Amino acid sequence: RRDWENPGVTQLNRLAAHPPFASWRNSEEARTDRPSQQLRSLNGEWRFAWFPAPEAVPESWLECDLPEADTVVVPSNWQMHGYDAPIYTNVTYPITVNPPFVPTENPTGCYSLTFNVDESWLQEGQTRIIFDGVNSAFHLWCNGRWVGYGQDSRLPSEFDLSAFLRAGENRLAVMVLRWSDGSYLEDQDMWRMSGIFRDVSLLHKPTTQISDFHVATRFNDDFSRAVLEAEVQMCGELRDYLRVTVSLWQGETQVASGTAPFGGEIIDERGGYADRVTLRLNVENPKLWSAEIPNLYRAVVELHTADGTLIEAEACDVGFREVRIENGLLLLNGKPLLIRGVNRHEHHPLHGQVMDEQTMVQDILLMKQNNFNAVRCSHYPNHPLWYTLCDRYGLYVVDEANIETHGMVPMNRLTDDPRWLPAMSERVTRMVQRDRNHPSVIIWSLGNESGHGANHDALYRWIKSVDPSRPVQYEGGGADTTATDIICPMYARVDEDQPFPAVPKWSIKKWLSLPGETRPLILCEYAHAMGNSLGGFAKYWQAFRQYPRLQGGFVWDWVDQSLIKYDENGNPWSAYGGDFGDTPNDRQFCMNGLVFADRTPHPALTEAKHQQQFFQFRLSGQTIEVTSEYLFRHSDNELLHWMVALDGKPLASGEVPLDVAPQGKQLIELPELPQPESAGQLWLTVRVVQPNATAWSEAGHISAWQQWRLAENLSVTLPAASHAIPHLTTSEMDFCIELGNKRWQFNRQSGFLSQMWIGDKKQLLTPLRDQFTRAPLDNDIGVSEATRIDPNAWVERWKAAGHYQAEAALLQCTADTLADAVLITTAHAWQHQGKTLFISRKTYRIDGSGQMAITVDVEVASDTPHPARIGLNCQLAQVAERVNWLGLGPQENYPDRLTAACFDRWDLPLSDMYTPYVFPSENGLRCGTRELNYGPHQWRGDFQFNISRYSQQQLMETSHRHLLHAEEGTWLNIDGFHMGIGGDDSWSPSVSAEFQLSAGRYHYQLVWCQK
Amino acid sequence: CTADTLADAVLITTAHAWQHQGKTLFISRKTYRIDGSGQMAITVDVEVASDTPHPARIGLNCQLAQVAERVNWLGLGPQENYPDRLTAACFDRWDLPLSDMYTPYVFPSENGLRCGTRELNYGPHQWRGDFQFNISRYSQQQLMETSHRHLLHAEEGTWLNIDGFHMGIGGDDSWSPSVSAEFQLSAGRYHYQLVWCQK
């Protein structure tokens, strides 16, 4: 029999799902969550062998381990050890589509563990083994005797070893298969790997047990009285002296308690359950749970006797909150939620898909510090410690079933087939049976990207039947199906519509206004941050804040899924799909996160932080309206620090303590602000600072900020008459301008500034030319490769029009001396295959004071695709350690993503000016720049600059950041106009028309001097 | 205000600033290049303060001494259009009588603007570039003072207003500011070029 090739068999001799059990024998040890000695961890050094097929495994492995097998640590994935190549694929299945049959070449991992069991465990009670996760299917042997079979990969599999274990030395043998019929339900967009990637534990229970318990909370309209209903299910012999005690604790203080004997209410004509008992505990003025204030209680269920002798104890964490939907609005504790969620994949920086507590805690801290209040367990149930840490730290959790058949054509082939109805149920129901006691979990999810079938509807309303306390959602079928209470499309745009046949993604504002539609909209996936991305996030959050039924969404996604490889010298470097020999692969589409693999923040994280602030600011006159977006907490750990700056020079500042009610308004009256008579723009900047240290933040954390323009003083002063005039000399090929120390040289053949001299030091390695092309971004490329070309992609439209190939032709290059200046007029045109795309007309005025003023007028054809860039390009010959600039910063910003950057004077190291994206592209641009100082050079005007050690040509050719080599000098790109980056999705043109260079005529002025 | 002769042109550089009660609102910097072929090229750079209200207009103003019967223009038309109301006008070559260039609103105001104009011919004069022009017999000062269209009197010559940038007119209501932010002159720095010649 081949159980891995049959969807009707998903388990053999596997125990029922339940909430996590520690099997305490002391109620005080359960209350404080002390470790239980009845639970043993089998994590550690296991013996491992690899085989190309399960049939190649010798049967002598069932008796003793092979001498040729290696020692590995469990949990791990054997693709991170050299036994296989991890396979990255987005939509296409990594195997031949032929359900439910897998290829004969099925990689097999044979794990073995030799251990000992105490004799007290064997005399009484039941001993079970728990596998928290095995990818994908596995067969279990205990002492050479077959125990059972498991198929699911993200839910624990539990087997009874009481009749298998022996005193002394015991050997457990697990045969794990890479591919199974369940892998057809596991088409998630991640790295496909395999192995025992989660914890292995051994649990000992008494003869009579606490088999299950369900804890629910019911409230009134005011949330001042609460009823905790705890229903307890036992296994074993029914005895009249058995009693249960349900105790609720806040810290060390008992709040409520209840003791009843076994026996339930009459339900049917035959009676009720004799092995179940329900307890109703009344709580007066409970402390409600939320993402703002995570108030937690400890619920201890003690199965004992009438004498008071404790048999067993099970403890859990209970949060008094109630999540429901009324009037098309999702309410938690009676208040409409605004979801600031993010999609999270379980990707360890070093160990692949093996998750520990440290990475969970770090990820939670960076999400909470960046104003994220929710998280999506995508696309599978997570590690049960993740949920507990979410309850402790206060994050909303959307628990999603491990179902995805994105590679099926059509996508609902398996979900409409009743033959796959059992197996899918085993991936849904058990999940609920594991996670219905966590208050962090507020929304159940059927899965992702599986079309719409009747199995989805059946499992959906099954969850509605068993657990009415949580709303449940599903994307497939167009996000309007009967299988969702919450509208959750992926990558739907704010204003424009994209009507695909029979699954149209209408705009969210239009979607809410459709005839007969009532449900709230929370985006399951939006704002694809794949590389240099996340443009239009301000539009998304403006729509969220303006519309009551637009309640936020989940950003895709948190962390890049890149794997560490090593070069010839052993230096580590991040790698993506296709770097391990896996073919076919979706090349860099595994990196969509807001942080790097080592949890280094991207510049997009600052924009996400600014757009998700819980404090909104409105400057009117000289007063500030501060509006809270907290729903349950008072502003008790926040103060407003304001400052006024004249062109980056501070003038006045102050600190005001914030006292704002939840979703309330506060007025702050600033003192008499300075009124300078010096030229420049006055900027008012406010920041919200937390003085005390929270469990997730440190003392002085900035949670919100805002900037406005105050009164402006335009400069009307005139420069003094420079005593020296520039000498202009005309050669047969060059124009040479002297000002004593400073010498400019223009080449009359190319028409560009050939060379600059200060003393005898050359300053330009390449001439100052025009640039209308950038290194293509991940949003620009989309899903277009060399083999398959997408004509809608921006990079393909640019290279089809010859933007990367067009050659500059010199139309005019004249020079003439003025009274106190030398005037250089140039005029070029860029042509490709006889078609003129761009025409540049520049005027260089060299004054006697030393400044060189460049006026640039660019004509752009309307029929050619809109250029990504209009500016200048040169390579300086000097590498300076510091870069100074008066402008927006200090992070990377773009025309469609700049609301987070503040206008000030920023000084940064040169290496900080380059964003180390794994896939090289355009990066490091700083918008709104009024002044730029680098070495001896100073540039003034209004421009967007990026300064780096890598040319745009090198950034275009190179596919990995570790292959980049620093070039001689420093590459500078000053641009009059720059095009937005997009970010609605990464397979369609996402740049809005307001951020496209579509005017046709552009003008910009620069001043180049030596400070 | 400086002037200097070039190899084959005469270059005139001017720079002004508009001030009210010691506060500078606008700064205009113009360059007049007079070529030997006859064309006069005007480049205008305007700096606008951010704290002052956004101006309704950024352009040039003059009064010609000649009243011609016909006005020709290559641009959007042939009707009156504005930056926020121009989707109906088509781009073509339109020839219209001068009296047709004035919209006879009962309450006098700004009227007769033609957007997207690439060429404008009036009498012997030709203007080229990208601009929004309105040509009439009534000054803007007269249109501001006068409250009824029948009290308007034709002035000597012809008043011409060529504007690099123009602000939208609104129309959502008539008791609140209805002009959208995309049609407001709020950038701060503006640039436009004109060519004045005799056809």
Swiss-Prot record, chain A:
This is Beta-galactosidase. It catalyses: Hydrolysis of terminal non-reducing beta-D-galactose residues in beta-D-galactosides. Inhibited by phenylethyl thio-beta-D-galactoside (PETG), isopropyl thio-beta-D-galactoside (IPTG), L-ribose, D-galactonolactone, lactose and 2-amino-D-galactose. Signal peptide: none annotated. Changing residue 528 to E/F/N: Poorly reactive with galactosyl substrates. Less stable to heat than wild-type. Pfam families: Bgal_small_N, Glyco_hydro_2, Glyco_hydro_2_C, Glyco_hydro_2_N, LacZ_4. Substrate binds at residues 90, 189, 449, 525-528, 592, 987. One of its GO terms (biological process) is lactose catabolic process. The record marks 345, 379 as: Transition state stabilizer. Changing residue 782 to A: It forces the apoenzyme to adopt the closed rather than the open conformation. Reduces the binding affinity. Homotetramer. Mg(2+) 1 binds at residues 404, 406, 449. Induction: By allolactose. The active site is at 449 (proton donor), 525 (nucleophile). The record marks 987 as: Important for ensuring that an appropriate proportion of lactose is converted to allolactose. SUPFAM superfamilies: (Trans)glycosidases (SSF51445), beta-Galactosidase/glucuronidase domain (SSF49303), Galactose mutarotase-like (SSF74650), Galactose-binding domain-like (SSF49785). Mg(2+) 2 binds at residue 585. Its EC number is 3.2.1.23. Belongs to the glycosyl hydrolase 2 family. It comes from the Bacteria. Binds 2 magnesium ions per monomer. Can also use manganese. The keyword Hydrolase applies. It comes from Escherichia coli (strain K12). One of its GO terms (molecular function) is alkali metal ion binding.
Curated annotation (Swiss-Prot), chain B:
Induction: By allolactose. The record marks 175 as: Important for ensuring that an appropriate proportion of lactose is converted to allolactose. Substrate binds at residue 175. It comes from the Bacteria. Homotetramer. Belongs to the glycosyl hydrolase 2 family. This is Beta-galactosidase. The gene is lacZ. The chain holds residues 826 to 1024 of 1024 of the full protein.
